[PDB]
Tab-separated table of N, CA and C in Angstrom:
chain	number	residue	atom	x	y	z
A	12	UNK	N	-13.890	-2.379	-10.729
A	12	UNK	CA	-12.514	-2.792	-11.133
A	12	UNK	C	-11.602	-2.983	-9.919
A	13	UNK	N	-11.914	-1.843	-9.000
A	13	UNK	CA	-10.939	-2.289	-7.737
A	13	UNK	C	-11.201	-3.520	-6.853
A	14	UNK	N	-12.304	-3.791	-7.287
A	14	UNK	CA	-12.907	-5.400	-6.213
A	14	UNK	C	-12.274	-6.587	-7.053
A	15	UNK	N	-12.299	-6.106	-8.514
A	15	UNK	CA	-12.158	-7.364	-9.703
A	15	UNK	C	-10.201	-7.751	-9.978
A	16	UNK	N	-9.854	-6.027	-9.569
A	16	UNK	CA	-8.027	-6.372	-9.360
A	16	UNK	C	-7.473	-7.118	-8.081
A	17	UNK	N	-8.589	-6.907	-7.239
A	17	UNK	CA	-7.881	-7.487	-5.972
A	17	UNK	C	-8.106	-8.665	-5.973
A	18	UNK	N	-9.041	-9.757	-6.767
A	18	UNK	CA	-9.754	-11.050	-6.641
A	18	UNK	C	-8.326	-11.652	-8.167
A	19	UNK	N	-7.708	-10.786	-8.459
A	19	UNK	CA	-6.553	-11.514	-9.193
A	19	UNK	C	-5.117	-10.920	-8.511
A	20	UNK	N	-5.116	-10.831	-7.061
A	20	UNK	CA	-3.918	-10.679	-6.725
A	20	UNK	C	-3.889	-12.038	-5.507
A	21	UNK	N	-2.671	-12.641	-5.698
A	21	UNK	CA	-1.895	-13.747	-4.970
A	21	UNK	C	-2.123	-13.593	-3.348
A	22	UNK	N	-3.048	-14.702	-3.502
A	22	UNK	CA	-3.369	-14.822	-1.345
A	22	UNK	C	-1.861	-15.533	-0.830
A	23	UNK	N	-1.669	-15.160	0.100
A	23	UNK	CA	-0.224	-15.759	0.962
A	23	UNK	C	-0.885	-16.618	1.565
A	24	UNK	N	0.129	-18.187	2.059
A	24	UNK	CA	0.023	-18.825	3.020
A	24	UNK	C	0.630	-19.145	4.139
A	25	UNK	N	1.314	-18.268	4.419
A	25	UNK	CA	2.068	-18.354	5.790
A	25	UNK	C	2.164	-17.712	6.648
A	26	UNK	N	1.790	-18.094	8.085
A	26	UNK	CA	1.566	-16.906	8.961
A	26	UNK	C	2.895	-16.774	9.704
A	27	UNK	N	3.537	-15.562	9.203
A	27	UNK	CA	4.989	-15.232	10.156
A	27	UNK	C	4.709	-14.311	9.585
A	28	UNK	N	5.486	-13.444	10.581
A	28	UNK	CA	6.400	-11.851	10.696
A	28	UNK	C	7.815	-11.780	11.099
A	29	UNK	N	8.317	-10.777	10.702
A	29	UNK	CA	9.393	-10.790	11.018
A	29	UNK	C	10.406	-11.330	11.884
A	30	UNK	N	9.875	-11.966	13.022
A	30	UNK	CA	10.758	-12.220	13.933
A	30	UNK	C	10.904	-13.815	13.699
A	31	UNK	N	10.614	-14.409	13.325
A	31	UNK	CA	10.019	-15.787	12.726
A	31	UNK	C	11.382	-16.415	11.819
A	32	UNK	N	12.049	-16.134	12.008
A	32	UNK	CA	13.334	-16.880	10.863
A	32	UNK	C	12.941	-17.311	9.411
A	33	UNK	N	13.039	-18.425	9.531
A	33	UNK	CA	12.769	-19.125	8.270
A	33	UNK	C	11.424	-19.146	7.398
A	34	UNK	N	10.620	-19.083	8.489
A	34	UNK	CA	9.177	-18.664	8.382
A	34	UNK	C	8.868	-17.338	7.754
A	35	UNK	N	9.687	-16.411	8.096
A	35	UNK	CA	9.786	-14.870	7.742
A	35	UNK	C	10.395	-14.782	6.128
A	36	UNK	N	10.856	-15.792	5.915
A	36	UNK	CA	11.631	-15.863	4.383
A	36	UNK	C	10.807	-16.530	3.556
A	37	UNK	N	10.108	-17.440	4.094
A	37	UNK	CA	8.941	-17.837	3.339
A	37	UNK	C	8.024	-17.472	3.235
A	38	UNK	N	7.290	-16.576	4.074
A	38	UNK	CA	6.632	-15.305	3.762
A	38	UNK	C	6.712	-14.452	2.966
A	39	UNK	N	7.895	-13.982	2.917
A	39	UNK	CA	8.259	-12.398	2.519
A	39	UNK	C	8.432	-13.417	0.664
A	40	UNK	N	8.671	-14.565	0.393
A	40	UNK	CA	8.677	-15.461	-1.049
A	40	UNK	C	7.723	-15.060	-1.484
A	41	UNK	N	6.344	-15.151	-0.722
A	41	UNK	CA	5.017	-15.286	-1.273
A	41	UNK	C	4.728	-13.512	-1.195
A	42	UNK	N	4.771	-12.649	-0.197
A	42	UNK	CA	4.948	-11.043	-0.632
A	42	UNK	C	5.821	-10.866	-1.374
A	43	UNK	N	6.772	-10.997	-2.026
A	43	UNK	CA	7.389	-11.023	-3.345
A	43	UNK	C	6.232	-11.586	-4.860
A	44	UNK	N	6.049	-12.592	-4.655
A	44	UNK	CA	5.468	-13.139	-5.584
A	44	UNK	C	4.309	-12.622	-5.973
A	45	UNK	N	3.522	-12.222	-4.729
A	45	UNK	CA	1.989	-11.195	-4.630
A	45	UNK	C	2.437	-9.998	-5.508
A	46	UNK	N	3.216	-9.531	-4.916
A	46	UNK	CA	3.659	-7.963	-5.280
A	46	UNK	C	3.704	-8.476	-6.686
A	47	UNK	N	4.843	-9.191	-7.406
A	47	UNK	CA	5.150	-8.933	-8.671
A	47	UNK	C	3.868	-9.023	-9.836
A	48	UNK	N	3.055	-10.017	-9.168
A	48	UNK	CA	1.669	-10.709	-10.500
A	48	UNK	C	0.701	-9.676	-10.260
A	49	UNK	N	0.610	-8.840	-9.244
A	49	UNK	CA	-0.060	-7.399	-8.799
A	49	UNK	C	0.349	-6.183	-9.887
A	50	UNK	N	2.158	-5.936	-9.805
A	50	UNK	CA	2.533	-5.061	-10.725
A	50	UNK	C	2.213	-5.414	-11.761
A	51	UNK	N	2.317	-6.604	-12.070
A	51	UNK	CA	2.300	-6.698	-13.795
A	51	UNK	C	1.022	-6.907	-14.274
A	52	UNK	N	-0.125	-6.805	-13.404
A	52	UNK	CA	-1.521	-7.167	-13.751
A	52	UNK	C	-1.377	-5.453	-13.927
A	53	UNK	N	-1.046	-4.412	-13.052
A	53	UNK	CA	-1.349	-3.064	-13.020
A	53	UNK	C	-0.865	-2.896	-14.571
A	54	UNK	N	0.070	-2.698	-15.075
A	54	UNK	CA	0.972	-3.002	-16.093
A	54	UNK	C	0.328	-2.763	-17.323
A	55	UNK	N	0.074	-4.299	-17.048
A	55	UNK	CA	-1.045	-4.626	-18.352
A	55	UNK	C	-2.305	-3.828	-18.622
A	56	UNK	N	-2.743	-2.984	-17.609
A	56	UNK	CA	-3.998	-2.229	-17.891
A	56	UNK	C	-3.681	-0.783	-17.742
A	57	UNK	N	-2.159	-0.552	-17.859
A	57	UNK	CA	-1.509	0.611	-17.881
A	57	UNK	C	-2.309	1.350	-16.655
A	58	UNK	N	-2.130	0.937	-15.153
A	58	UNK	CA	-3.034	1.296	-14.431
A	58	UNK	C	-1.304	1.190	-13.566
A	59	UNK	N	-0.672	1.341	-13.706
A	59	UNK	CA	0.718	1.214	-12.831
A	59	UNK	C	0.933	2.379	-11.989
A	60	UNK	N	1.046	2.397	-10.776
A	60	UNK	CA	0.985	3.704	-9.548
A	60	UNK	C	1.589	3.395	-8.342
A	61	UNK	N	3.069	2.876	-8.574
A	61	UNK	CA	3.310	2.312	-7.319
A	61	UNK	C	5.294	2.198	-7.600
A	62	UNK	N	6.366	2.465	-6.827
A	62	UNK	CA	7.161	2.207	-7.322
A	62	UNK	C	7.982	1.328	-5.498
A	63	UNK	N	8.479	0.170	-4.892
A	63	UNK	CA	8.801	-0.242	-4.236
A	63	UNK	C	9.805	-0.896	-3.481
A	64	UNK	N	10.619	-0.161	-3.477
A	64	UNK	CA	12.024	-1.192	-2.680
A	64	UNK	C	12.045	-1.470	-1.124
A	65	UNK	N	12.578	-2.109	-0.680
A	65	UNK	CA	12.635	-2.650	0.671
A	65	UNK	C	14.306	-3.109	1.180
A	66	UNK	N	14.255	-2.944	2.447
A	66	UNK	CA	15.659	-3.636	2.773
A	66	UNK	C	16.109	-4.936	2.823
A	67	UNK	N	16.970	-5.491	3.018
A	67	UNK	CA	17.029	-7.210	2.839
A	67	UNK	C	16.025	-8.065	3.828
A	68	UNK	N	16.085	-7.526	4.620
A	68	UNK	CA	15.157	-8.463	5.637
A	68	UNK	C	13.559	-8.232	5.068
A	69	UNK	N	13.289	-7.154	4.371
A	69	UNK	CA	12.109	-6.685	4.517
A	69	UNK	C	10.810	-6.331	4.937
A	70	UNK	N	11.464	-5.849	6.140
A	70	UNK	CA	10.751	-5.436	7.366
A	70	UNK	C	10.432	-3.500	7.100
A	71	UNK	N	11.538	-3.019	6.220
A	71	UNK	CA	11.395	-1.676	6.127
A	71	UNK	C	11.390	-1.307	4.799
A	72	UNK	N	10.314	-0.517	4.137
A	72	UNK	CA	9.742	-0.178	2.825
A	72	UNK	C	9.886	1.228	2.609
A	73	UNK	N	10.237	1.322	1.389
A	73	UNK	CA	10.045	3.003	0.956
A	73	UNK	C	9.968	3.074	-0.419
A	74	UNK	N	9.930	4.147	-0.742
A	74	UNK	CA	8.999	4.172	-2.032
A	74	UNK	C	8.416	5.113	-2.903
A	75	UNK	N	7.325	5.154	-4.162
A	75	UNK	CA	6.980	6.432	-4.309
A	75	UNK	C	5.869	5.470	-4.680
A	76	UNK	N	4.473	6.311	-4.741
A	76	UNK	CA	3.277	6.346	-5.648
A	76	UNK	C	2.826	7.597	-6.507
A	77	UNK	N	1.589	7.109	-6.945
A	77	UNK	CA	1.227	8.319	-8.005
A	77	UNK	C	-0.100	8.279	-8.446
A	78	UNK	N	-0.983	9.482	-8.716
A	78	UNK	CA	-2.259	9.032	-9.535
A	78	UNK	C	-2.135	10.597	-10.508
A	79	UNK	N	-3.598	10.102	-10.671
A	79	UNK	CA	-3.717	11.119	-12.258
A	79	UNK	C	-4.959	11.792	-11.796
A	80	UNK	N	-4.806	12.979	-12.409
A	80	UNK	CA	-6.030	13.871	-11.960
A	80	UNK	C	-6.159	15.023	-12.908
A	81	UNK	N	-6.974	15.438	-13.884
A	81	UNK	CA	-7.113	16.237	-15.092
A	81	UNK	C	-6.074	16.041	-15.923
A	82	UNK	N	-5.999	14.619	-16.073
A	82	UNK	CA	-4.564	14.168	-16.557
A	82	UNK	C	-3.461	14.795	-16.614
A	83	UNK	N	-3.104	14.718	-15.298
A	83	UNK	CA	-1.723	15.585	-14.560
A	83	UNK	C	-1.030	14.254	-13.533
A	84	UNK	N	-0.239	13.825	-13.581
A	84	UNK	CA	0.648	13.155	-12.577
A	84	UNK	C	1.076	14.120	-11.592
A	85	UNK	N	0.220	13.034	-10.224
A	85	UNK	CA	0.884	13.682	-8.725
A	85	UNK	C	1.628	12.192	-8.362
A	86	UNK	N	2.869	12.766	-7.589
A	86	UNK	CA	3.871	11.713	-7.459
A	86	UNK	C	4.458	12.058	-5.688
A	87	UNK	N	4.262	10.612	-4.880
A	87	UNK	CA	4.772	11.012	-3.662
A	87	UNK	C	5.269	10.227	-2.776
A	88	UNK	N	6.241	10.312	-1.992
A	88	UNK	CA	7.258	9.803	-1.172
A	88	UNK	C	6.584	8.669	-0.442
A	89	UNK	N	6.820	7.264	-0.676
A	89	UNK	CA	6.034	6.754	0.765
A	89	UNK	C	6.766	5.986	1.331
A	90	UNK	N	6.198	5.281	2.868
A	90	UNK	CA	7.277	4.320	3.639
A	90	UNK	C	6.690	3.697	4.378
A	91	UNK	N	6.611	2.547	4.916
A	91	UNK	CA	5.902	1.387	5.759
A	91	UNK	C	7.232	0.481	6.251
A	92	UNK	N	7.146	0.253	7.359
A	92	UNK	CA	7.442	-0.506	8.276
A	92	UNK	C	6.583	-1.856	8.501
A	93	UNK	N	7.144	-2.811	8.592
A	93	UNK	CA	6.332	-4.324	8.533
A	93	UNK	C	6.085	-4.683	9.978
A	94	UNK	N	5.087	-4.138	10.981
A	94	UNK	CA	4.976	-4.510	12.151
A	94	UNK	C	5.687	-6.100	12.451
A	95	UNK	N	6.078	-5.782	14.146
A	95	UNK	CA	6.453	-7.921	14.286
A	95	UNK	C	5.404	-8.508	14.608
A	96	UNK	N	4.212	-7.836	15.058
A	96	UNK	CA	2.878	-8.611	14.876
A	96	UNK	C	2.293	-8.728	13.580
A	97	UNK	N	2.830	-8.461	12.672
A	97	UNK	CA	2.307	-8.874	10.959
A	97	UNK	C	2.459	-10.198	11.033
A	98	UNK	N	1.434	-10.866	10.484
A	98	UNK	CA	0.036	-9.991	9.270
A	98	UNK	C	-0.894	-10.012	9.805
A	99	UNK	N	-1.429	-10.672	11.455
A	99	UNK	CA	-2.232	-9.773	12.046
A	99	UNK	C	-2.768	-8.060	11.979
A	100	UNK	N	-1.410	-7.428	12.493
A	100	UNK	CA	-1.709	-6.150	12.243
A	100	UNK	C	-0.364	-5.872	11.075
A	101	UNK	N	-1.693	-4.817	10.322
A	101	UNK	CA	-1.202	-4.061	8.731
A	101	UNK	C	-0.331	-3.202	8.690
A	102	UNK	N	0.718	-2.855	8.356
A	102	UNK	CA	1.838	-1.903	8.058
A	102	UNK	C	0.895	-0.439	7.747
A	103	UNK	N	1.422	0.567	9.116
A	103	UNK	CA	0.811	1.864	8.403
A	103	UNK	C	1.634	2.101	7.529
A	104	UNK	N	1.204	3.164	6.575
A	104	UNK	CA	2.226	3.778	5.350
A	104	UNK	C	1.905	5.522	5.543
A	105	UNK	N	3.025	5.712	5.393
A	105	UNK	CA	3.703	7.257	5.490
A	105	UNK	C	3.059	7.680	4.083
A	106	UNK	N	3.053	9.336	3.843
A	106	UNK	CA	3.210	10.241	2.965
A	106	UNK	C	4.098	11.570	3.354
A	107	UNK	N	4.471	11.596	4.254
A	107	UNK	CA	5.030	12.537	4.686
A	107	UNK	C	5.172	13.874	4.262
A	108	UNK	N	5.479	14.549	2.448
A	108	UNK	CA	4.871	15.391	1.978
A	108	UNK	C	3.975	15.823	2.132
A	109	UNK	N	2.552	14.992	2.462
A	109	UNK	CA	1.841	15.457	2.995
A	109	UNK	C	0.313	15.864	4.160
A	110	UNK	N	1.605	15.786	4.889
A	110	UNK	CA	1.242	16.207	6.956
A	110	UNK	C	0.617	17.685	6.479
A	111	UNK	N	-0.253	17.897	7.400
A	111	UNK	CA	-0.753	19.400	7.384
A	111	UNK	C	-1.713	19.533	6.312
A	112	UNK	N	-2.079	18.874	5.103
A	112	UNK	CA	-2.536	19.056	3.620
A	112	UNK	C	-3.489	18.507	3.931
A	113	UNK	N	-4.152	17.504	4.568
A	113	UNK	CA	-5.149	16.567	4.709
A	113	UNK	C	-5.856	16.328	6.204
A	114	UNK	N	-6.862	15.814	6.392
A	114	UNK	CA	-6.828	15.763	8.087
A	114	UNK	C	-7.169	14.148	8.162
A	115	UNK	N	-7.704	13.601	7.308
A	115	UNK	CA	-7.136	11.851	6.869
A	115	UNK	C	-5.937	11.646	6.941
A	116	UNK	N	-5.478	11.772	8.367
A	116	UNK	CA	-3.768	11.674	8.062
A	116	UNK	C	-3.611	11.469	9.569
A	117	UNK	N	-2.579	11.128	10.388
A	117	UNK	CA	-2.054	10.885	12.030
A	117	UNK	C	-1.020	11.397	12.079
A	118	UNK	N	0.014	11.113	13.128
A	118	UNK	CA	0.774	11.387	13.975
A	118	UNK	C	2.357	10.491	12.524
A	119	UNK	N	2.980	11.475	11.696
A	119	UNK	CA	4.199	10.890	11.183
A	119	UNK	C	3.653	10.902	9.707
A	120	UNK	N	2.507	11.344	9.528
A	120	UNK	CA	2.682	11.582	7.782
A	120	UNK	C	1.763	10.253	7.748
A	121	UNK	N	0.940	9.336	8.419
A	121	UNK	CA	0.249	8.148	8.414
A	121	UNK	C	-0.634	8.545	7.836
A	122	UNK	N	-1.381	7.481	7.046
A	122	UNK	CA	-2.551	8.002	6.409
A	122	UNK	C	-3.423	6.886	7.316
A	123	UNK	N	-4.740	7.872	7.647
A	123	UNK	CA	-6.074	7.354	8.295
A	123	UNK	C	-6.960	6.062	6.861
A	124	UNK	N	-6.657	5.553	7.086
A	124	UNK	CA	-7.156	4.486	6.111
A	124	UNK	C	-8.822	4.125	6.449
A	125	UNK	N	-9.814	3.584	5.659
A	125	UNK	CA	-10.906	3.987	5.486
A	125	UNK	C	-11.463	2.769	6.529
A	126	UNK	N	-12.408	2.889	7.210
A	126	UNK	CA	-12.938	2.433	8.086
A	126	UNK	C	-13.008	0.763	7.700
A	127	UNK	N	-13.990	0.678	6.345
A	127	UNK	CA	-13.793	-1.118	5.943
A	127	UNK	C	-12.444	-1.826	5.681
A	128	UNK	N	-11.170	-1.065	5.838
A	128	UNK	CA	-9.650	-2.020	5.618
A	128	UNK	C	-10.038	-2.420	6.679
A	129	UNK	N	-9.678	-2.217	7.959
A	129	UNK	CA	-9.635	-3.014	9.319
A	129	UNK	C	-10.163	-4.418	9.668
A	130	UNK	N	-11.666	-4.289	9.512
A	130	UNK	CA	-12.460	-5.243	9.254
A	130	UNK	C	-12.157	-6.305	8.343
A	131	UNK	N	-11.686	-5.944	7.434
A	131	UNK	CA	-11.496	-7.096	6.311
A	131	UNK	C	-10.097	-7.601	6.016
A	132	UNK	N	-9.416	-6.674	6.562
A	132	UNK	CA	-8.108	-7.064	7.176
A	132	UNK	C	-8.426	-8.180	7.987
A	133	UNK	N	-8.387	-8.049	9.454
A	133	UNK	CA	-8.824	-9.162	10.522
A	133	UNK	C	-8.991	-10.004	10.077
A	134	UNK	N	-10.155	-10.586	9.280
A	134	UNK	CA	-10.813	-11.686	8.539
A	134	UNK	C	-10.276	-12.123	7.711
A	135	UNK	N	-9.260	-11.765	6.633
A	135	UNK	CA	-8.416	-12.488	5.488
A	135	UNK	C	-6.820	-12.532	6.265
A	136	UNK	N	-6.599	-12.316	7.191
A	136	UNK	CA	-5.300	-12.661	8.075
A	136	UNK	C	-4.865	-14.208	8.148
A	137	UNK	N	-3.776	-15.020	7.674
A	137	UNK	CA	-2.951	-14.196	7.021
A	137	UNK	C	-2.561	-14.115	5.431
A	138	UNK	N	-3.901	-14.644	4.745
A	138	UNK	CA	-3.766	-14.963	3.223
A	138	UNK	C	-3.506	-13.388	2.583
A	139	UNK	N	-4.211	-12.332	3.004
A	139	UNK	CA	-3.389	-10.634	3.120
A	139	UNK	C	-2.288	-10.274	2.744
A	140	UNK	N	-1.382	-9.866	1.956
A	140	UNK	CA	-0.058	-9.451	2.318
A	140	UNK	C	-0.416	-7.771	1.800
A	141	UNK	N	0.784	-7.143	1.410
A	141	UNK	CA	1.044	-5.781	1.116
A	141	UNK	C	0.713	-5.559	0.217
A	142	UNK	N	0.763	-6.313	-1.079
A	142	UNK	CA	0.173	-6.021	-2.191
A	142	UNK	C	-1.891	-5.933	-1.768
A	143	UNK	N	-2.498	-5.965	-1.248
A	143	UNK	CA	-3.288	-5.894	-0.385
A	143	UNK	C	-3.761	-4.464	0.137
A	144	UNK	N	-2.698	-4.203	1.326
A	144	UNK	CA	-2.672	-3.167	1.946
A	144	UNK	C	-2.930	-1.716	0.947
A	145	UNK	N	-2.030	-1.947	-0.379
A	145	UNK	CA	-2.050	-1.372	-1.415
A	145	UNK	C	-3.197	-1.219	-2.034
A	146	UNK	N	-3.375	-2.139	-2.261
A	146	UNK	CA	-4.488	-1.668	-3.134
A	146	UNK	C	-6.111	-1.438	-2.822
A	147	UNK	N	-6.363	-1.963	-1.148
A	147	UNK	CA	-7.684	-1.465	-0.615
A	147	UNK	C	-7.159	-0.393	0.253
A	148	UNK	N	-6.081	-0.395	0.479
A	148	UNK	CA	-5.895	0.928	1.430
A	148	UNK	C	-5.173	1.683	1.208
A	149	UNK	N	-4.038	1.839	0.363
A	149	UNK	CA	-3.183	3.148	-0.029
A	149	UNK	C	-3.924	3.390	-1.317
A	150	UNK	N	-4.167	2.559	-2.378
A	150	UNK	CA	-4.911	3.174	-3.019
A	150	UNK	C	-6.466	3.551	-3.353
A	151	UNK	N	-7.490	3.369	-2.586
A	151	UNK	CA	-8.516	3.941	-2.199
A	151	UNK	C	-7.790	5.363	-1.757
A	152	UNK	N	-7.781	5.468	-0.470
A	152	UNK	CA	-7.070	6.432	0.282
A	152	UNK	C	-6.424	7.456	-0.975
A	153	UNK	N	-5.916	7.797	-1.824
A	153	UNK	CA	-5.443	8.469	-2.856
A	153	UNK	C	-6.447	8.935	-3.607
A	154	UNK	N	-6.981	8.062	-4.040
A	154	UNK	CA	-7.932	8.504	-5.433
A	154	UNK	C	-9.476	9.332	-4.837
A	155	UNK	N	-9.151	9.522	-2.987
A	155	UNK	CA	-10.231	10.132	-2.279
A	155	UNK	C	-9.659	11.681	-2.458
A	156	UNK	N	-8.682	11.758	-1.788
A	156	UNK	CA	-7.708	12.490	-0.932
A	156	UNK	C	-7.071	14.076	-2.051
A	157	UNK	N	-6.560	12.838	-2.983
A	157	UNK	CA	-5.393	13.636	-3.782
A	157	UNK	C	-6.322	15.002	-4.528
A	158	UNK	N	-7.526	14.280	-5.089
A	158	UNK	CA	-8.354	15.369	-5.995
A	158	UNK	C	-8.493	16.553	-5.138
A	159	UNK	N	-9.109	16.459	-3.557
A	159	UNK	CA	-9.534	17.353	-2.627
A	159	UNK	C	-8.032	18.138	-2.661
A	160	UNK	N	-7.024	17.620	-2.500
A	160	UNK	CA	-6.178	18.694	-1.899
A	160	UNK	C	-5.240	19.675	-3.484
A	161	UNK	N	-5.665	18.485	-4.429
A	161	UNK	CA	-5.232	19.627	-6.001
A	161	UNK	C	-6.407	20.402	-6.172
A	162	UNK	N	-7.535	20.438	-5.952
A	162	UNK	CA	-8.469	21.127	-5.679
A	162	UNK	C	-8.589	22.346	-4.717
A	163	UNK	N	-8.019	22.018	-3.576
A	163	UNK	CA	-7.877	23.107	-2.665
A	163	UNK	C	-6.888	23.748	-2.697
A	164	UNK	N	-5.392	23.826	-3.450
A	164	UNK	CA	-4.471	24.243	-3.923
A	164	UNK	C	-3.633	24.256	-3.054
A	165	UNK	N	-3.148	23.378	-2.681
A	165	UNK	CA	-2.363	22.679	-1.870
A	165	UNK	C	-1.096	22.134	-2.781
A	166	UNK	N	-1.319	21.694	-3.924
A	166	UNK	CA	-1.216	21.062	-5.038
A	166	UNK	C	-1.427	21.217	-6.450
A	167	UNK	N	-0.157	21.449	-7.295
A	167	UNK	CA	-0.088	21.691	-8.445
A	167	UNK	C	0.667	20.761	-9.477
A	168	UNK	N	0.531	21.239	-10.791
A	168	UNK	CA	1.368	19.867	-11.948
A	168	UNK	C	2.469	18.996	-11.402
């Protein structure tokens, strides 16, 4: 299902980042547009785990996610920054709650994302956007992570 949601989320066609003017607005059209047919595909399969605002330029993201685990909702703070080398290179994303809880994790609450994003990142650059990042790499990364650390009691209802 996670190979079959991502093959119905919206490829981008424009290669800019932020620093890019006009280019950067027509970008960020088509990461708008990704994002929304993404949520509402999640939606529809009541598979929804993601909540997202950004600043006007949208270069800076914050946020919450969530998964389910002995059918219990865990819910948590997140934040990404849109590198100015995007969409070359991928926006890390924060958890910051929880630093210290995991060792899949870096320097600021970053989560260590799984060895095949990188790779397949590179190669779909820049048809890629965030809705993307999301869903092979923040959410993989979760549905590994979260069980181990409500498991190790780190983590409760």
């Amino acid at each position: 299902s996670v190979k079959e949601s991502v093959s119905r989320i919206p490829l981008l066609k424009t290669k800019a980042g932020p620093r890019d003017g006009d280019k950067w607005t027509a970008r960020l059209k088509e990461e708008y547009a990704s994002l929304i047919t993404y949520v509402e595909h999640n939606k529809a399969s009541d598979s929804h785990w993601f909540h997202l605002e950004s600043n006007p330029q949208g270069t800076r993201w914050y946020g919450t996610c969530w998964t389910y685990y002995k059918n219990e909702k865990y819910e948590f703070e997140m934040n990404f920054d849109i590198p100015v080398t995007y969409p070359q290179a991928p926006p890390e994303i924060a958890l910051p709650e929880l630093e210290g809880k995991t060792v899949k994790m870096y320097r600021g609450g970053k989560i260590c994302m799984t060895t095949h994003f990188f790779p397949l990142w590179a190669r779909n650059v820049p048809y890629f956007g965030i809705s993307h990042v999301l869903a092979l790499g923040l959410g993989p990364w979760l549905s590994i992570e979260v069980p181990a650390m409500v498991e190790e009691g780190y983590l409760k209802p």
